[model samples]
Target chain A: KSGVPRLLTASERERLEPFIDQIHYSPRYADDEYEYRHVMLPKAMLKAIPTDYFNPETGTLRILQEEEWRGLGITQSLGWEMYEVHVPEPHILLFKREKDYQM
Target chain B: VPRLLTASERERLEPFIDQIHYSPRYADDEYEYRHVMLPKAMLKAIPTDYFNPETGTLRILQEEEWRGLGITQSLGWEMYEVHVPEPHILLFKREKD
Candidate 1:
């Protein structure tokens, strides 16, 4: 099933803005039609999210990243969803999976 | 969340926007947050001072201020804070009583 769509609160989005710079993109898709973005969650911000969003054993959370590209000067959406809590930092990765075995 | 208005959109929206009011705070004490998205055209229609383009934030009008613009007010509405993540996106934060 699809996880929550655009699941990040306003505070989480603001908290997430500063961390967008550390990303370095490389080719991740070759055969599958999907885009994967991984960000490391900051330790200090971890406490801000609810405990239910975490599953430590897998290290992957069910959520989608909100669109807020600073250079565009737009958050594009205030979109938020429930069940999945977004922890903005270095330890989060997004999965846009199609077919069978990809993010 | 950012959906710009068409002529039809503006026609339908103006009525509700005209009726803007301050809602009373709820009974729960925890901080609850919700957000809304407005179009860039809509933001342009408001005062420029209310926005911070550099930070992508906007200011919420105070009770006294909104009175000038004509909005119904209640005691608890002043307790709310309007936070900004972007100029078009606003975070409506309030605490429960």
Candidate 2:
């Protein structure tokens, strides 16, 4: 874990509930032939994403980009450049964000 | 401390519960406080159609069963309740040996 992500308010949690379980963090792989940065999403979840988000099936999420996060209001809650979410249950997920991280 | 997951609400909370982890701090660590995390979505909204304890409809989690359910309900995992119009967010943290 690198940095703590911003805590969502009661209302904020409600807004992000649908996409919550599916979001996660994947660190950049180290200097090896096969190393790369990636995140995973179920095709169903990807297709089912509510409006405001662009088609994820097009591939590679730009969650780090400011405009992208603004749509979901994550940027206002976020504290770090690199971040990932931890799922706590159907309605709960935790975000861990940081400026820098390494494996 | 003690809680019941509905036949409906049960499945969703499992993944959320699995991911919340606590690691005790070391002697050198300096920490002021921690925030209480509540899963509001998991808080089942009471419904009229499914109210249990009636004939032909049975509600699970009797007193004994509830006491035995979650690990948090074991031994010292007691909680004090306060009257409130609505639930609030806050979690108490304690470290272990």
Candidate 3:
């Protein structure tokens, strides 16, 4: 119900780089001018990975904002979801709900 | 799991021709079967680009794009859709409130 989990680690981050330019971030990010520079160059798009970090203990990821998704180029028309690398199953599923409330 | 693409995404894509597409970008790609969710309005809009499950990439429909991926006028709502074999390929969604 909350939406998709975050991308963990630099390797996982690399997978989404191809579509980075198309990504957008929330205005808040621009206001703060946050630059997620890391051990690697600031090559990946901002907020492309979760603003939250990987929970090494849980071995899972978490991203709290849909605005963060915009940074990935997945915009108003899209949300985030996670996928498993080893298996053919999707670990997370991103989606948008219909605007209307139906009975 | 429907995602958005920039206008630039078109530049990189190989159009899908004579080929059917599918994916698990959304919730319905279950082991039993895939479920496709098409908005009545969007289907009527007749989109040129769609995510192809086969390559995990977005494909542009070609010369006969309209025919290959055509939208029908809605019966009551603004859009209408015909079904495909596997419907799990839906990607992109209306922004959250």
User: Across residues B36-57, which tens digit of lDDT does each residue of candidate 1 receive?
Assistant: 2343344445444644454334
Query: Compared with the true structure, what per-residue lDDT tens digits does model 3 show for residues A39-81?
Result: 1113334334443543333233332345444434443433233
lDDT of 3 by residue, B18-91 (tens): 13233342223321223223332333233344544543323433323322332222112111122221111112
Name the 10 consecutive residues with the lowest summed lDDT in model 2 chain A: A90-99
Model 2, residue A71: distance off in Å is 6.4
Q: Tell me the spans in candidate 3 whose CA falls farther than 4 Å from its real position.
A: A1-6, A22-72, A77-103, B1-81, B84-90, B93-97
Fraction of true inter-chain Cα contacts (below 8 Å) kept per model?
0.00, 0.02, 0.01
What is the DockQ score, from 0 to 1, of model 2?
Answer: 0.02
Comparison by TM-score, 1 against 3, better one: 1
Off by over 4 Å in 2: A1-15, A32-36, A55-64, A70-103, B1-97
Show the lowest summed lDDT stretch of 10 residues, model 3 chain A: A87-96
Alpha carbon lDDT at B45, candidate 1: 51
Residue-wise C-alpha lDDT for candidate 1, range A27-86, written one tens digit per residue? 323224323222334444444443444444333343333432222122222432212333
Task: Give me the candidate number with maximum DockQ.
Answer: 3
Which one is best on TM-score? 1
Interface RMSD of each: 19.4, 17.6, 15.9
Each model's total of backbone clashes: 10, 5, 10
Cα lDDT tens digits, model 2, B12-52, are 44544543333332222322221124344433532223324
Cα displacement (angstroms), candidate 3, residue A65, comes to 8.6
Error in Å for residue A46 of model 1: 17
